[model samples]
Target: MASKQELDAALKKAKELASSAPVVVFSKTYCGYCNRVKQLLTQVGASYKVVELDELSDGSQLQSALAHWTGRGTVPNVFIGGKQIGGCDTVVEKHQRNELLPLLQDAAATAKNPAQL
Candidate 1:
C-alpha cells in the first residue's frame, strides 16, 4: 500500500529518524545481520537508535521509502551523522580499517549535547 503520497510521507519520516541520533540503525528484530551491527556498535562504545521496521504497521511502506532514500534495500541500514553507511559489510569493513572510531568520535563531538559523555 505504498502510494506516492505514502512514500513521500514515509521518506520524510525516515529522514527525520535517521538524524534523530548520532547513530541510527534501521533494523528488523529477526535479522541476524542487524544483531551483529548492534553488537559491534555496543562493543565499540557507540550508542545508537534502532528502528525495528517489522514491528510497525507501515513497516513495508517505510522500507520502500528507505530503499528510495538509501538506494539499498536492506535492513540494518546504518546512518552516521545523517549520512548513509550502507549495511553490515560496509560497517564491518570500516571498523576493521580502524576508521570507525574517528567517525564515531566526530559524531559525538558535534552532538547536540556536549555532555553526551
Candidate 2:
C-alpha cells in the first residue's frame, strides 16, 4: 500500500484524468465487485477509465485517499465528470432505480458540448 503522501499524489492524478473521461473507476485487481462495476458500466456503453489501485504499493492508502475525496470508504469508487457516483452498491442501486442511464447520457452530452448550459 502507498503511504499517505503517495496516495495524495495518486488522487491528484486521478482527478486530472477524470477531467477528460466522463467516468472513472478506481478498482482493485482481485476484487470481484470491482470487476462487476466495470462490467456494469460497459454494459451501459459508458466509457470510463479504470485505475487498478492494487497495482500500486499504496493500494490501501489510495483507497483511504478516495474515502477522503468522496466521503465514502469503498472500492470500485465511481466518478462521472469529476462528480462521485459512489461505490459498486450505490452504482447498482442507481441502475436499479433507472437513474444510471440518464446520468451517463448527460455525461456523454456534456463531453460533446462542454460549454452547453
Candidate 3:
C-alpha cells in the first residue's frame, strides 16, 4: 500500500513531468488505451513526452497516485499544457469533433514558439 505522503510525492513527480512539455502522457506498457492515444496524436503530427510507468519496474506508487489524483487511475493519463485532459475516450470524442487536432497542433506550435500563445 502507498502511504499518503508517498502518493503526494508521486503526484508531484507526475505533475512535474507534465510540466516538462506541452504534451505529456503518463502511460504503461500493457495499457492499450495509451496506444490509442498515441496513435491519434501521431496522426496529427503532435510531439509528446511519454513516460512508460511499467517500464520503470517499481512504479506502483505513481500508478496509485495517478488514480487518486484523477477520476480514473488508468494509464494514458493525458495532459496538455500541464493540465489534465481526460483519457482515450475523451480523446476520441474530441477527435471526432475535430477539437483534438487543433489542440495538438497548437500545443506543438506553442512549445516551439512561445509567441504563438
Candidate 4:
C-alpha cells in the first residue's frame, strides 16, 4: 500500500512526464508488455519518452500510483497527448484497426503546432 503523500508525489511526477511529451510510456524494465509497446512505437518511428519505474527505488509504488491515478491498471501504461489510452493490447488492436498512427500523428501535429488549431 502507498501513503497519500507518496501517491500524490508519484501522480505529480507522472503527470509532468506525460504532459511534457507527445507520448509518455510508463513501463517496467522486465515487463514484456512494456517492451511490446515500446518496440512497436519505435518500429513506427514515434518520438516519445519512457519512464521505467523499475529503475527507481520506489518504482513499484510509482507504478501503482500511476495506474491508480490514471485509472489504467496495467504496465506499459500509455499516454498520448496527456491522455491515458490503454496498454499494449489496446495499442496493438488500434494498429490493427488502422487508428493508432492517425491518432499519434494528429496528437503530435497538434502538439507541435497548437496555434494552428
Please report the candidate that would top lDDT against the real structure. Answer: 1
Once superposed on the true structure, which residue ranges of model 3 sit more than 4 Å away at CA? 109-117
Q: List the residue pairs that clash in candidate 3.
A: 67-73
Q: Which residue runs does candidate 1 get wrong by more than 4 Å?
A: 109-117
Q: lDDT of each model, Cα atoms only?
A: 0.84, 0.77, 0.78, 0.78
Clashing pairs in 4: none
Candidate 4 regions with alpha-carbon error over 4 angstroms: 109-117
Candidate 3 least-lDDT 10 residues: 108-117
Instruction: Kindly report the root-mean-square deviation of model 1 from the true structure over all alpha carbons.
Output: 3.3
How many clashes (backbone N, Cα, C below 3 Å) per candidate?
A: 0, 4, 1, 0
TM-score, structure 2 vs. true: 0.78
User: Which candidate leads in TM-score?
Assistant: 1
Pick the winner on lDDT between candidates 1 and 2.
Answer: 1
Residue 92 error for model 1, in Å? 0.5
Question: Candidate 1's C-alpha lDDT?
Answer: 0.84
Tens-place lDDT digits, model 4, residues 3-64 = 88888887887788778888888888888889899988887667778888879667787787
Model 2: per-residue lDDT, tens digit, 1-117?
A: 646677778678667655657788888888999999988888877778887787856667667777777778588888887888889999999989979868888887334434432
